[PDB]
Amino acid sequence: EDPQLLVRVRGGQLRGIRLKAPGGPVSAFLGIPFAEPPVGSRRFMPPEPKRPWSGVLDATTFQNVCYQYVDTLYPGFEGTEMWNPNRELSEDCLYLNVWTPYPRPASPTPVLIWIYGGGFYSGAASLDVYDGRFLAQVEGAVLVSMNYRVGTFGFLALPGSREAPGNVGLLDQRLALQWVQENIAAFGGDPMSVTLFGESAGAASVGMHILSLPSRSLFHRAVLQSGTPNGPWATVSAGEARRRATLLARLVGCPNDTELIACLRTRPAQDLVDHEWHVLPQESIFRFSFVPVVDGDFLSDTPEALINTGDFQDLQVLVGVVKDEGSYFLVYGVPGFSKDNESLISRAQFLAGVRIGVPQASDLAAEAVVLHYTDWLHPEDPTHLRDAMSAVVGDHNVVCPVAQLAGRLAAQGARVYAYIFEHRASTLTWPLWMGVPHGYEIEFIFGLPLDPSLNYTTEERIFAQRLMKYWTNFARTGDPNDPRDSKSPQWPPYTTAAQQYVSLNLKPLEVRRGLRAQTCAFWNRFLPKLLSAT
Amino acid sequence: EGREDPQLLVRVRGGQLRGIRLKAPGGPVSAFLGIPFAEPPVGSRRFMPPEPKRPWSGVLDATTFQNVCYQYVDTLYPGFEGTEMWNPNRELSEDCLYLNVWTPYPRPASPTPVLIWIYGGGFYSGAASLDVYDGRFLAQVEGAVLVSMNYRVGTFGFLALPGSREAPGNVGLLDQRLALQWVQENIAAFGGDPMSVTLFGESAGAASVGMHILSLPSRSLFHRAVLQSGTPNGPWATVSAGEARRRATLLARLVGCPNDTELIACLRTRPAQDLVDHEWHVLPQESIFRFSFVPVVDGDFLSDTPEALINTGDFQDLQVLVGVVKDEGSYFLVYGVPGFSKDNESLISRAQFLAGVRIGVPQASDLAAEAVVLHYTDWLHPEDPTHLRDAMSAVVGDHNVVCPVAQLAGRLAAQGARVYAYIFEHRASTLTWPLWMGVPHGYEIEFIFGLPLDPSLNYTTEERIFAQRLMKYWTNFARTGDPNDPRDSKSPQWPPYTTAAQQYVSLNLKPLEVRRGLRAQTCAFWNRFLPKLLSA
Ligand SMILES: *[C@@H]1O[C@H](COC2O[C@@H](C)[C@@H](O)[C@@H](O)[C@@H]2O)[C@@H](O)[C@H](O)[C@H]1NC(C)=O
Ligand SMILES: *[C@@H]1O[C@H](CO)[C@@H](O)[C@H](O)[C@H]1NC(C)=O
Ligand SMILES: *[C@@H]1O[C@H](CO)[C@@H](O)[C@H](O)[C@H]1NC(C)=O
């Protein structure tokens, strides 16, 4: 037995597996339980710490994916399948994964904790794009990723109830964070240097740990990729959570909160998922049924209120967006859009897409969006209209929420670094019109281009090495700039005054100013004033 | 007769006239100045439509400009050429309905296209006798017959109690119409062609031209139109019948006049200066680019709002030239926006910007005003004093001129008209206004009229050549309905403005450059978005 692969944690002993990375071996400890299986009476309930076990636990394999909706829009297509569960679905899914250098670090190493996205309705830490072996091997990092409950199982709330209090998926993440504090030193990780990073709902999740005080003692730095806790999709009110929970229950024949939740707990998992999408208040895209709730507990106030009034003095944050945040979502609901054609649309279809794409928008607000995003020199041009549709969805849901967060954090004392990611992977299977879609920076940050069997260009490999360095420098120091390297040029902090951010592409860093400043002023300053009066 | 110049004696329908031979740089021109076209609108005729001038006996002396219509005289910067150039240069009188004709010397043997100038000044000021409106250069260099008329302004031209017989409103426009009828009957005596008449005007003059396009009785009196930095549509060129009535009766109160017959009769007893002294007191809000007595939508001269009439009109056998200067708003900022002056750089604070926007968009709600502020703010430099100053200028110019012109051009083009559009971007070397104002409202006119040709005025040689270019464009358009030269085609062409391609030309010292979209995005804000906000 290899002593590098044998670790004692508080719960007992584990056996990991030596994996081959391109440059050398790594130690992986996969499928480690951090909670009691949240099954039977424990459904919808906060997670409990895993009971200690006897002997040596086999941690050589990824554990089950949390029970979730699986996308079926394009069967057998790698662009969609790469996000689908790659292990069996189960409610028993509260396990985490650790990658370390082989041999394990001689001195305490900065820890990166990955929180996947998927709209709080999907995702898994076992996906090939979240493979931590490259960062471990090349950068010497200790990388951790956890499964958290998604959908009804993670976020169905009857606020104020003891049995479905809400945000339990977020508590799953917090428990994995606690597990790292208590146990990561055994693997050579430094619990006094923990960086959370995540994409999409994962970045929103990272954001919620920033805004929830009990999470704050469990990490030191944060990275939010293409997602925020503020914004239109990441939270609901307690009233809207209750309403959706009560409707889902009706839809499955259930049944006083106690009685309603008891009947929901009797239902086969797939029975809940069958009706998951039927509880949304309007026809929409970029809207998810069961998400974090403003409960007055995990989240003391709305994230908007919390970012406006928080003190973020001793925090460093890396945030950013991809060049084409909205394109990917268009094919999941807006008529005229499809991966299989160029998606050239009419004005009529633009107007209709805006109502679906900004579902809470009133008639007047929807007219303001159309009038702002129309190119009045080319008002009927299908290429313009299609690209504007993408812009509306990406700006409303990601870019402007991100600018808003960056600015508040910066004003309230945080050290902030911002990027836009603009390289389209040579291997991308989505069509050209989608540009650099949501999610397609991740494979570069994780260093997948360094596996020569994946057929990335040598440029893409060098670029991936640049990104791995920015991320791990940031984890190490709270500054993504290389401290032993001179020229570059340097990545400046994002500030409310200068509003500097950098482009991440195959060219050297270029510094730009103003992250869609005019358009986000429309979204962040004008539209709120509109509908709070009308 | 006997000893006088035989080219200076002409008979019109009312009698015999004697003109004057004037010197232009390239040679002599004939001028017939101060020809009366109406009975003096005095006493019981105050506020009343003009009646045609009754024939006179003997030879009327038409050798000097006549009285300027009674008006408010700008007093903000006394001694200063920049303002005095617009001020009255003849005696102020209610007896002011006279017109001017310049023609070549000797008068042309075959009938020549006629240009009729209508001055601006917010419908409260102006005269055809001002030096910037001197027709001699066009007459001499282009062989043009040029006509300009005085029309009543202020209360005298536009005070209305709509529905009344004694103060029906729009009579200043009726003065202009009567001057157009005079040209039809009489211009052939000077060698002018009454079947080729082009109206042109600036500011309120341009608005007036647009209103002659929209008023059917005017349509037989002219064939083509040029609107410079003004339009009949937009926030200032007209008022509703209710607003006219409201202002007329407030004015009456302020001058001691308490049934419309009795009110108007009391107003007719008041000294002219008493009316001028309270003219500005009747505006509903603190404002710039708003004028108390302007054309009224009376359901007669204007059968509907200009907005309605341009959206539904048939303009098929109409050619129109329209444009703007680079900095329409700047001039207006010093007549009411706190923080602004010709004698400093007018760098303003954000607070002054927000305050200025309420004054510059006086009919805007709180929400609309904040939409404006949010649109014009540069969110990279929300507090830069230079950007704020320039944004204030842009707000005022776009709202009042540039976007109404874009709206006008689009409707005209979509409904059959041949439209040619420009932006004029040359700053006169002789301009006395400060540099921050850029190319202000009013400062294309001296070039169209060819003042730079007078070497005593000290324009550069390049400006002389540029004036000659503009004069060709305007007279080519007058001749043919196309500003382009028939022969010369190596030069770059001025393509028509269309809704599809939205093309217009830069007018500056360089050859014509074609550009697309007149402030397309920002005018979508003013012309499409704001009115939808106004609906609730
Ligand atoms: C510029 O002037 C504005 C208008 O007030 C005056 O004009 C200046 C030139 C002086 O002659 C003063 O005596 C006048 O009252 C001011 O309101 C504005 O603040 C000025 N800008 C600055 C900062 O100088
Ligand atoms: C693209 O394809 C989809 C479905 O195959 C269809 O709904 C859409 O109308 C198509 N659009 C174009 C550009 O023809
Ligand atoms: C034009 O220039 C001359 C010669 O220097 C000067 O004396 C005269 O005053 C100037 N005239 C004007 C109109 O400013």
UniProtKB/Swiss-Prot annotation, chain A:
EC number annotated for this UniProt entry: 3.1.1.7
Domain of life: Eukaryota
An annotated GO cellular component: cell surface
A single GO BP: retina development in camera-type eye
Topology versus the membrane: Peripheral membrane protein
Residues linked to a glycan: N256, N341, N455
Catalytic activity line of the entry: acetylcholine + H2O = choline + acetate + H(+)
MF-aspect GO terms: acetylcholine binding; acetylcholinesterase activity; collagen binding; identical protein binding; laminin binding; protein homodimerization activity; serine hydrolase activity
Localization, UniProt: Synapse; Secreted; Cell membrane
InterPro entries tied to this protein: AB_hydrolase_fold, AChE-related_enzymes, AChE_tetra, CarbesteraseB, Carboxylesterase_B_AS, Carboxylesterase_B_CS, Cholinesterase
Subunit structure: Isoform H generates GPI-anchored dimers; disulfide linked. Isoform T generates multiple structures, ranging from monomers and dimers to collagen-tailed and hydrophobic-tailed forms, in which catalytic tetramers are associated with anchoring proteins that attach them to the basal lamina or to cell membranes. In the collagen-tailed forms, isoform T subunits are associated with a specific collagen, COLQ, which triggers the formation of isoform T tetramers, from monomers and dimers. Interacts with PRIMA1.
Protein's UniProt name: Acetylcholinesterase
Organism encoding this protein: Mus musculus (Mouse)
Gene (UniProt): Ache
